[PDB]
Write a protein that holds these residues in place. Sequence first.
Motif, PDB file in Angstrom:
ATOM      1  N   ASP A 188       2.097   1.785  -3.549  1.00 42.28           N
ATOM      2  CA  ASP A 188       1.193   2.414  -4.345  1.00 42.28           C
ATOM      3  C   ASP A 188       0.976   4.051  -4.153  1.00 42.28           C
ATOM      4  OD1 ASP A 188       0.593  -0.102  -5.909  1.00 42.28           O
ATOM      5  OD2 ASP A 188      -1.208  -0.418  -4.250  1.00 42.28           O
ATOM      6  N   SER A 220       0.816  -1.257  -0.058  1.00 37.97           N
ATOM      7  CA  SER A 220       0.030   0.047   0.062  1.00 37.97           C
ATOM      8  C   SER A 220       0.701   1.301   0.073  1.00 37.97           C
ATOM      9  CB  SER A 220      -0.840  -0.112   1.174  1.00 37.97           C
ATOM     10  OG  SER A 220      -1.304   1.154   1.663  1.00 37.97           O
ATOM     11  N   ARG A 277       0.185   4.478  -8.660  1.00 37.20           N
ATOM     12  CA  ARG A 277      -0.410   3.558  -9.482  1.00 37.20           C
ATOM     13  C   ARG A 277      -0.692   2.212  -8.725  1.00 37.20           C
ATOM     14  NH1 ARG A 277       2.241  -0.070 -11.505  1.00 37.20           N
ATOM     15  NH2 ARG A 277       4.684   0.220 -12.169  1.00 37.20           N
ATOM     16  N   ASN A 278      -1.312   1.286  -9.158  1.00 36.71           N
ATOM     17  CA  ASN A 278      -1.519  -0.036  -8.518  1.00 36.71           C
ATOM     18  C   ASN A 278      -0.332  -0.796  -8.995  1.00 36.71           C
ATOM     19  OD1 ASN A 278      -4.163   0.212  -7.273  1.00 36.71           O
ATOM     20  ND2 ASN A 278      -3.978  -1.997  -7.513  1.00 36.71           N
ATOM     21  N   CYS A 279       0.894  -0.999  -8.189  1.00 39.86           N
ATOM     22  CA  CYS A 279       1.806  -1.687  -8.686  1.00 39.86           C
ATOM     23  C   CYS A 279       1.897  -3.264  -8.416  1.00 39.86           C
ATOM     24  CB  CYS A 279       3.034  -1.236  -7.854  1.00 39.86           C
ATOM     25  SG  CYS A 279       3.162   0.534  -8.466  1.00 39.86           S
TER      26      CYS A 279
END
Length: 164
Positions: A47, A44, A52-54
């Motif tokens: 990110d 979390s 971005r959602n890695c």
Amino acid sequence: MNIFEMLRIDEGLRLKIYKDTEGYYTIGIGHLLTKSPSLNAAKSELDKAIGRNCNGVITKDEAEKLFNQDVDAAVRGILRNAKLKPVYDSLDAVRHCALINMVFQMGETGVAGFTNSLRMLQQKRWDEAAVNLAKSRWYNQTPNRAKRVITTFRTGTWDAYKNL
């Protein structure tokens, strides 16, 4: 050689979350994410940091960008800290790099705790400060890196890294 190449040698580059020497979640070039045991908390923070959602993985570019922020912040903090600034200002350009490296690794706070060593550096008693810096948990826990930094303070050249 410069701060960036010095640090890339000491920290390495890893594109997937990993645990540092102390067991904490990190990624990139020594970018600590969290001291929490939760990989979840780590993903979390990652990110939030990249935006971005890695899914726990990042690209080279993202790693370098985080690396530039961190070096900047390290320098800025040194410049804002009352105990470190005076030492930094008193040092030559090579030695500035060694203090930045300590800062990046252990934080402003931790370095600032090296009172006696800081005083010796400011006085330019290289041999003495090198012996004093060696008497620390830091040296006992990451001895090869510590020794590279220490010699840098001691000699004021990049010899410890010309190998590497």
